Design a protein around this ligand. Structure first.
Ligand SMILES: C[C@H]1C=C2C=C[C@H](C)[C@H](CC[C@@H](O)C[C@@H](O)CC(=O)O)[C@H]2[C@@H](O)C1
Length: 400
């Protein structure tokens, strides 16, 4: 269970603490717990607190997903519309299909336009070079000889597509592109849009994209410490290969900092479907399979690949899953755990979240790890959270 499992990891020195926040739609069952300690830049230790500012890493993707769907409500975008005009950098990408045996690249022009739905579901073709061996080999020719200049989204993610748009699945910068599209069609920064449309309606004021400049937030950053004087989020990412340090502007793929308490407000608004962020029908559409037949087969292949455990977010290999607007989507019940159409993703190696509408539960679990981060231990700690919270929910339901 969380209490003894987290304490054992603290005792071995592999984590400093954790923040866990879960709730049902109405706030009847609520579980909030901060465990352990944080270290300040001065070396002073403090108990972990529920309003400590956390690095969301790819938990950002859910929030960016919401922002893009709000633009859809506004009429500024559509899920299936052609993005070539707003994002010509995407339209100009070609599809890399393989290499000759003399290692010459083979590519083809894109067969169709890239759409917002493709960006939100990682079926556009844009792939992380560190997850896609083919794109990683292409990247190691057109080498940045480390021009160290800070780069916008469009200047960071310059690789060709990994497959014809709509026909595959690979995790990538789809939401960094979607965030840029939001900035272009609204005429403001992503932080401005999110603050007005997501944070203000929920009474959230303690959030920033990297770099965190606000003095009050920096005083509460878990990741501002002697192991991380740059507050880069190294502990969450598992090691510093920092995109954060080399970036310029907001990165909707991974950039946000937020408290656990504020993150669960976003989850619960979706779970309750209370109209604070999106109209109910728009939310319902998030919880559907949005991969086509070829993309779905590509998705299942990645889930069976050596990176599958990361892409499965703790779900069992026998459970059928798809990808919704915002994360992985389960397609069948697991009795005692996630109901069908549970949406789930995470950040780094240390953070995971879920929204289970059928069983009426949502929650985020964010381990605060010690460098160097033990990846196998993080998976176990995340699994303990994902199952222990349901055991706590059952006990509470039994006591009513
Ligand atoms: C749900 C999780 C799934 C993932 C899929 C593949 C990876 C393991 C992700 C972690 C990436 C991160 O560790 C790598 C970063 O160093 C990226 C970089 O800075 O180079 C992970 C995270 O995005 C969250």
């Amino acid at each position: 269970h969380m209490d003894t499992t987290f304490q054992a990891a603290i005792d071995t020195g592999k984590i400093n603490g954790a923040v866990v926040c879960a709730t049902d739609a109405q706030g009847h069952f609520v579980y909030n717990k901060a465990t352990g300690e944080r270290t300040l830049l001065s070396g002073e230790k403090q108990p972990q607190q529920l309003d400590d500012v956390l690095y969301l890493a790819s938990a950002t993707k859910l929030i960016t997903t919401i922002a893009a769907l709000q633009c859809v409500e506004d009429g500024l975008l559509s899920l299936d519309g052609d993005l070539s005009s707003i994002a010509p950098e995407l339209a100009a990408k070609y599809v890399l299909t393989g290499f000759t045996d003399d290692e010459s690249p083979l590519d083809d022009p894109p067969a169709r336009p890239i759409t917002l739905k493709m960006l939100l579901t990682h079926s556009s073709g844009t792939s992380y070079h560190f997850l896609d061996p083919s794109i990683a080999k292409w990247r190691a020719q057109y080498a940045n000889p480390e021009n160290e200049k800070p780069r916008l989204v469009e200047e960071m993610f310059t690789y060709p597509l990994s497959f014809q748009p709509g026909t595959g699945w690979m995790y990538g910068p789809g939401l960094d592109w979607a965030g840029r599209v939001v900035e272009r069609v609204t005429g403001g920064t992503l932080m401005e849009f999110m603050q007005k449309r997501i944070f203000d309606p929920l009474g959230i004021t303690d959030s920033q994209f990297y770099p965190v400049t606000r003095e009050d937030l920096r005083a509460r950053l878990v990741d501002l410490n002697p192991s991380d004087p740059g507050a880069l989020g190294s502990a969450v990412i598992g090691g510093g290969g920092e995109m954060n340090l080399r970036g310029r502007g907001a990165f909707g793929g991974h950039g946000l900092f937020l408290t656990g308490l504020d993150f669960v407000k976003i989850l619960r608004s979706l779970l309750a479907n209370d109209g604070m962020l999106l109209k109910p029908a728009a939310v319902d559409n998030m919880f559907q399979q949005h991969l086509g037949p070829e993309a779905a087969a590509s998705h299942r292949a990645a889930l069976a690949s050596p990176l599958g455990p990361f892409f499965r977010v703790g779900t069992d290999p026998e459970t059928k899953v798809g990808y919704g607007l915002g994360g992985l989507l389960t397609l069948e019940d697991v009795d005692g755990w996630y109901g069908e159409r549970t949406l789930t993703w995470g950040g780094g190696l240390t953070l995971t979240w879920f929204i289970d509408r059928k069983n009426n539960l949502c929650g985020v679990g964010a381990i605060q790890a010690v460098l160097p981060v033990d990846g196998d231990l993080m998976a176990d700690l995340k699994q303990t959270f994902r199952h222990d919270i349901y055991r706590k929910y059952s006990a509470w339901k039994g006591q009513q």
